[PDB]
């Protein structure tokens, strides 16, 4: 998956496609918009390939990671989604949406204590009042 | 309508992506090559070399029927090229279908003008019981 590719790239330390600027920003933006065109039409499998492609080229990109994590969550691949949401948070530390969605995933993974920690973080640190209500609704059910 | 039909990505960038897909393939980075060849086949299903790349990945992963299916399409997408038929013969042998495999290698021998490919096909035929 995306995470194992990132680790292999790091182990081998050899030149990556991004290291040589193999794909311009403008083309990456286009491919990202095509990925959502597929996603928005319900073509989830093609969207997944396109987000995997983006995450091979530029793994450390919150927008690409969040798109792939959403697909895994929809596909009920909850651990893969949770792992990617955590990468996104590490790279975009001021947005608690990935923490909220990780909480949902942990609930489906039968890890209510991990889910509780996620929803509590949202309520303590997010300034998104609507996201906080949603997190509290989950907490109320735990 | 394909993404290629509307020139969604410039030709030179697609060439680079194909070369990167083959780089992953040659380095044994099969998961990444598979993503890249799937990307290429979404962009232009009608490109025989893109299809052959994905079929090769499936064959390496021992998804022999899935490979054979794509090879039949590739044979339609190529220019009198019996290489996909040769690889279908290999897949059929792995699927325990030796008479189907024999027919594949015989077709290569009878129609192909690629002498090196025919040598390979004959070596398989010689071993079939
Ligand atoms: C994305 C994120 C950030 C912080 C904590 C968690 C978690 O799962 N705690 N149990 C997840
Ligand atoms: Cl937030
Ligand atoms: Cl837990
Ligand atoms: Cl198969
Ligand atoms: Cl048979
Ligand atoms: Mg507050």
Swiss-Prot record, chain A:
It comes from the Bacteria. GO terms for cellular component: cytoplasm. One of its GO terms (molecular function) is identical protein binding. Its main location: cytoplasm. It is found in: Cytoplasm. Keywords: Chaperone, Cytoplasm, Plasmid, Virulence. SUPFAM superfamilies: TPR-like (SSF48452). The keyword Chaperone applies. InterPro entries: T3SS_Ca_resp_chp_LcrH/SycD, T3SS_Ca_resp_chp_LcrH/SycD_sub, TPR-3, TPR-like_helical_dom_sf. Assists the correct folding of nascent IpaB. Once it is bound to IpaB, it binds to IpaC and impedes their premature association that would lead to their degradation in the absence of IpcG. Belongs to the LcrH/SycD chaperone family. NCBIfam families: LcrH_SycD, PRK15331.1. This is Chaperone protein IpgC. The lineage of its organism: Bacteria, Pseudomonadati, Pseudomonadota, Gammaproteobacteria, Enterobacterales. The gene is ipgC.
